[PDB]
């Protein structure tokens with residue numbers, strides 16, 4: 001019953017873009033899908049408020065860092081609420097309890113003998129917020145940039161605590177091979193295994209040139225590497241260091257870390273090493289998703305897609321749908337103003353909206369707003385119902401692999417079958433007929449159409465909560481008839497349906 005799922009927590013240095021929304025909406029779907037399938041869900045999201053990337057942004061505006069971090073964190077939380085993210089905690093690394101969780105992890109790591117003091121010299125990217133070797137850098141017209149990210153970098157000489165990541169090279173490979181579903185998609189798993197197979201170096205995990213961060217226990221001259229306290233948020237969200245609490249007993253180890261492909265090393269290499277050191281159970285699964293481009297990365301150079309405005313321009317549930325359908329989850333895809341509209345027009349307004357409005361209006365005008373009593377199901381009726389009866393298990397299967405796009409595609413294939421069934425059955429002809437065989441068929445074909453629309457509506461709840469709820473409202477479904485257990489219970493004939501209205505204006 002317990003299920004603990006998390007998102008990456010965002011740098012509140014600038015405003016959110018669609019990519020941030022992509023990850024919160026995707027993770028929200030999974031969360032809502034589990035709640036509807038009788039799971040006890042915990043859903044963590046939040047912001048990563050420390051580090052030099054955020055401090056140098058507050059210096060680029062005139063405001064203290066804490067204030068920039070607080071204010072821009074509100075903007076991230078306000079954005080998530082606007083997109084209807086059902087998170088159970090919005091964590092912020094400035095929270096006092098997170099300060100204590102981070103300090104305990106350090107203790108257990110130092111007590112295991114995996115932390116040692118030494119001099120560090122190397123090339124640090126503030127944007128990426130990670131260290132680079134001279135080799136993974138290139139000099140371009142007198143500017144020092146990263147070979148992969150092309151990011152600026154600053155030379156740094158400091159005495160810092162290191163982590164014996166070198167001590168965990170082989171345990172990690174062994175864990176990777178005994179836990180095949182630990183990293184997904186498979187392409188990314190192969191990439192982590194290759195990196196670790198080449199050997200790991202020890203990792204600087206503290207800083208002395210600035211104090212914006214969590215205070216290293218018994219060493220105020222140091223603050224933790226921002227990624228060390230950032231990864232800890234997944235423990236903080238479960239009640240650590242109170243490992244005897246109800247929260248930590250049932251929710252840790254986390255079932256699923258949702259992240260983007262650029263931060264996999266921190267989650268699949270560093271994070272499990274830190275937990276083996278501190279004697280803590282590892283997460284069960286990390287799924288790294290792709291990046292959303294615009295026609296072109298999303299650079300503050302003038303190419304940002306604002307998710308709140310995107311939602312105001314087209315609706316919350318329309319954006320959530322397009323993001324989880326347009327892009328095979330796990331691959332890289334791109335946004336375009338034209339692709340979102342055509343997608344919405346063909347998939348929501350027509351393929352699903354018409355089928356629901358056309359069927360719900362015949363019930364209003366010809367059957368006195370009551371679900372009709374169906375007769376015997378012909379071979380066309382039962383085979384359509386069969387398709388819709390077997391969806392829950394196909395869709396569940398897809399959600400378990402993080403393929404929401406294939407879950408949606410499956411729902412729409414049935415809807416296509418439903419429209420094509422609506423056309424071969426021509427129920428608008430039978431309504432007029434005074435014969436009794438035509439009427440019963442009219443009553444039967446209309447029930448079948450409403451019934452499969454009700455199943456779709458239920459299965460759509462995780463992606464389009466509001467619209468699905470609207471459709472179920474128009475189908476006379478009560479508030480306790482909206483779990484996945486209701487999928488297998490047939491629409492009750494004769495229920496009073498309210499007068500139909502547009503779901504996708």
Ligand SMILES: CSCC[C@H](N)C(=O)OP(=O)(O)OC[C@H]1O[C@@H](n2cnc3c(N)ncnc32)[C@H](O)[C@@H]1O
Pocket residue numbers: 007008009010011018019020022023048230231232233258259260261262263290291292293298
């Ligand atoms: C303990 S976790 C700390 C994480 C760290 N604080 C951090 O990396 O912060 P972040 O704000 O820059 O990125 C936050 C998340 O959004 C993703 N992301 C970023 N741009 C994206 C895009 N264009 N498309 C899809 N996903 C994207 C990105 O891959 C990441 O998973």
Ligand SMILES: [Mg+2]
Pocket residue numbers: 017018019292293294297298303304305
């Ligand atoms: Mg963008």
Ligand SMILES: [Mg+2]
Pocket residue numbers: none
């Ligand atoms: Mg397609």
Ligand SMILES: [Mg+2]
Pocket residue numbers: 323324325326327328329330405
């Ligand atoms: Mg997707």
Ligand SMILES: [Mg+2]
Pocket residue numbers: 394410
């Ligand atoms: Mg299938």
Ligand SMILES: [Mg+2]
Pocket residue numbers: 439440443
């Ligand atoms: Mg009749």
